[PDB]
Paper text:
The Ets transcription factor family consists of 28 genes in humans containing the evolutionarily conserved 85 amino acid Ets DNA-binding domain, originally identified as a viral oncogene (E26 transformation-specific). The Ets domain is a variant helix-turn-helix (winged helix) structure, comprising three α-helices and a four-stranded antiparallel β-sheet. Here, we present the crystal structures of the Ets domains of the entire PEA3 subfamily (Etv1, Etv4, and Etv5) together with the structure of the Erg family member (Fev). Furthermore, a new Ets dimerization interface linked by a redox-sensitive disulfide bond is identified, and this dimerization is shown to result in a significant inhibition of DNA binding, potentially linking Ets transcription factors with cellular redox regulatory mechanisms.
Fev lacks additional domains and has a restricted tissue expression. Crystals were obtained from constructs that contained the Ets domain, Etv1 (encompassing amino acids 326–429), Etv4 (encompassing amino acids 338–470), and Fev (encompassing amino acids 42–141). Etv1, Etv4, and Fev display the typical fold of the Ets domain, which contains three α-helices (α1–3) flanking a four-stranded β-sheet, with an additional C-terminal helix (α4). The structures are highly similar (typical root mean square deviation of 1.0 Å over ∼90 residues), with the main difference being a two-amino acid deletion in Fev, linked to a shift of 30° in the orientation of the C-terminal α4 helix in the Fev structure compared with the other structures. Similar transitions occur in the Fev structure where Asp-99, Arg-103 and Tyr-107 adopt different rotamers, and the disordered Arg-106 and Lys-111 become ordered upon DNA binding. Similarly, an analysis of the crystal contacts in both the Fev and Fev-DNA crystals reveals an interface that includes the same components (α1 and α4 and the β1-β2 loop) as that of the other three Etv proteins. However, the dimer interfaces in Etv1/4/5 and in Fev are not equivalent; rather, they differ by a relative rotation of ∼90°, reflecting the different orientations of the α4 helix. The contact area for the Fev dimerization interface is ∼700 Å2, spans 21 residues, and accounts for 12.5% of the monomer accessible surface area. Similar to Etv1, the interface is dominated by contacts from hydrophobic residues, a single hydrogen bond (Asp-59–His-72), and an intermolecular disulfide bond between Cys-135 and its symmetry mate. We have been unable to test whether Fev also forms disulfide-linked homodimers, as our Fev constructs did not produce soluble protein in the Rosetta-gamiTM 2 E. coli cells.
Residue numbers in the entry:
A (entry chain A): 42 to 137
B (entry chain B): 46 to 137
């Protein structure tokens, strides 16, 4: 995988594992589907974690496209801010 | 094939499973609302019919040393997910 500090997938899972964050990000729809209830707030919070003050939703959504090819995530068609976590694809990326 | 941590995350990513397992308490903490049901469901997935809560809890405590899961204090049937420790175990 590689390699360094906190990555977007980890931060999103941390946010999704706390119901206190339901106002900006939440598990919704089933089968690893989650929705960005407040896309700009998720982006602002990721900006604080990585000490990147110029962080916005455009840059955040750009970083999610890396996970489609790596098969860690996918984007729900028809919907605007609904994404899906692929735990089988994540576990595969974890294996040596 | 599938490991316990992956199966638990899959269960926890669906609110329809709230009756047996759910994110509760914050900071990666989750509770086994029905411990025997989680164990029964894990038994179906791994085709292990002899699976019970005793065997499941033993496997959950194994992730403490691997730093994927952490012990929760002051709460019964509660476990904590360490996403930092998981990400570290994912790195080569």
């Amino acid at each position: 995988k590689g390699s360094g500090q906190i990555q977007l997938w980890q931060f999103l899972l941390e946010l999704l594992a706390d119901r206190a964050n339901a106002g900006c990000i939440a598990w919704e729809g089933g089968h690893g589907e989650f929705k960005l209830t407040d896309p700009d707030e998720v982006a602002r919070r990721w900006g604080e974690r990585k000490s990147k003050p110029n962080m916005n939703y455009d840059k955040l959504s750009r970083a999610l496209r890396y996970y489609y090819d790596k098969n860690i995530m996918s984007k729900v068609h028809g919907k605007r801010y609904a994404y899906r976590f692929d735990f089988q694809g994540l576990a595969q990326a974890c294996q040596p």
